[PDB]
Ligand binder design. Structure first.
Ligand SMILES: Cc1cc2nc3c(=O)[nH]c(=O)nc-3n(C[C@@H](O)[C@H](O)[C@H](O)COP(=O)(O)O)c2cc1C
Ligand SMILES: Cc1cc2nc3c(=O)[nH]c(=O)nc-3n(C[C@H](O)[C@H](O)[C@H](O)COP(=O)(O)O)c2cc1C
Lengths: 230, 230
């Protein structure tokens, strides 16, 4: 069917033309996102649509000079939001890590619906997690209140590049039957050879990134917004 | 188009027939999940397929006595997995909170592709966050190693019910233009009235749950697995 063909044809697009996304298409992308499942129907996700060209230039820099944040037809920022709940009832305890986990999982579900809706219309896109490296600055720029935090952005627009589909680890590595199965390093070596053909190896690149520190300012940032304190 | 029609037609299915999901259908649902975007191509999601009927009964009780976990044709468990990376290179530091946020976001994105693929074939499903009620006991049952943690499960199967689509908060409440906008409590009242017509109000029910403690055992659980320590 068309749904599965769309899911399997995905590739991140990082070059866009200047053709805008119509109001009808944008309203449909947001509705597709809203139709996503929500943990306990809590509805903990907020989207900040950035149209101001000066804020977009600042966001591209805050993302690590990723130019497509400025050139994209639409830039959406996904945020955890327990301020809606806190405004309704001030007795809400939003600082439990469980709530940040729900915020992250639900944001991913919603965002994927938005991206899939866009891709089905012939649009292209890419998630922007780079915003987290300058989290406090992005948070202030968007005026996010207490009980709210930035997670990632999303570029949407008409493609001006056609990259090849990137291979993933095989299903027998990622999927386990009944109990977790120990890793066979021969599968990692085969995947590394598959990635070298597409393009330092994959395993050497990813484990080398994790051998150092991974954005150490993230927990103090979440805590400063009143999230994940216990 | 068909992808958008499938996305908007979603409703959680909690009643299934005894008809199984074929091998061709299951392999497609997994391949759809793998086609999802991955933060820094880290591929930190592991899926545990539970076919053992004795384990299913235990998971149903651990999930807060949710019978559909036992009667579903397929029950997939989504987990954060940095053990594959640690097996390749022991020097990997997997304890930074940033890495748990990547794990949670990436799992949500992957899981949604799996559900959408299933829903497009005429199947139904529901996410099961209830596994977190007894996270440490669910972890021991599935044999998850260090640097790995359970997030949620997913029931999949042929529907034996036809629920009406549940309305969400309007687009103007969830989407903010350029800067975060303050909440107009009239919109929450309008929404509560829309939810009363569908069926204490939505706003009072969700904020009442958040006024209590939300799974306080979660951070210690992640910490016990070597995750979210700093
Ligand atoms: C990660 C996550 C966890 C969920 N866990 C449960 C669960 O344990 N039990 C259940 O019956 N529903 C669960 N749901 C499903 C719903 O509560 C649901 O999405 C919702 O109330 C909105 O209804 P709909 O999906 O039918 O539109 C979960 C949803 C998400 C996104
Ligand atoms: C939450 C998340 C954040 C991401 N952040 C970035 C980013 O900041 N910039 C970028 O160029 N791509 C980013 N990506 C996209 C990928 O690097 C990408 O999904 C990947 O390498 C696999 O390639 P494909 O999506 O083309 O299949 C992100 C993906 C996810 C899931």
């Amino acid at each position: 069917n068309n749904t599965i063909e769309t899911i399997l044809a995905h590739r991140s697009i990082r070059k866009f033309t200047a053709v805008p996304i119509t109001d009808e298409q944008r309203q449909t992308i947001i509705q597709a996102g809203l139709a996503a499942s929500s943990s306990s129907m809590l509805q903990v996700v907020s989207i900040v649509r950035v149209t101001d060209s000066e804020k977009r230039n600042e966001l591209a820099q805050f993302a690590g000079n990723q130019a497509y944040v400025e050139s994209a037809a639409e830039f959406l920022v996904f945020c955890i939001d327990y301020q809606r709940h806190a405004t309704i009832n001030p007795d809400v305890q939003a600082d439990f890590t469980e709530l940040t986990l729900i915020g992250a999982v639900d944001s991913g579900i919603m965002a994927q619906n938005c991206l899939l809706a866009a891709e089905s219309m012939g649009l292209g896109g890419v998630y922007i997690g780079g915003l987290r490296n300058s989290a406090a600055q992005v948070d202030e720029l968007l005026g996010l209140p207490e009980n709210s935090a930035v997670l990632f952005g999303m570029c949407l627009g008409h493609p001006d590049q056609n990259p090849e589909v990137k291979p993933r680890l095989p299903a027998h590595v990622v999927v386990h039957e009944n109990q977790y199965q120990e890793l066979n390093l021969d599968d990692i070596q085969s995947y590394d050879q598959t990635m070298q053909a597409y393009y330092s190896t994959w395993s050497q690149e990813v484990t080398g990134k994790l051998a150092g520190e991974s954005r150490p300012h993230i927990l103090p940032y979440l805590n400063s917004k009143g999230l994940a304190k216990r």
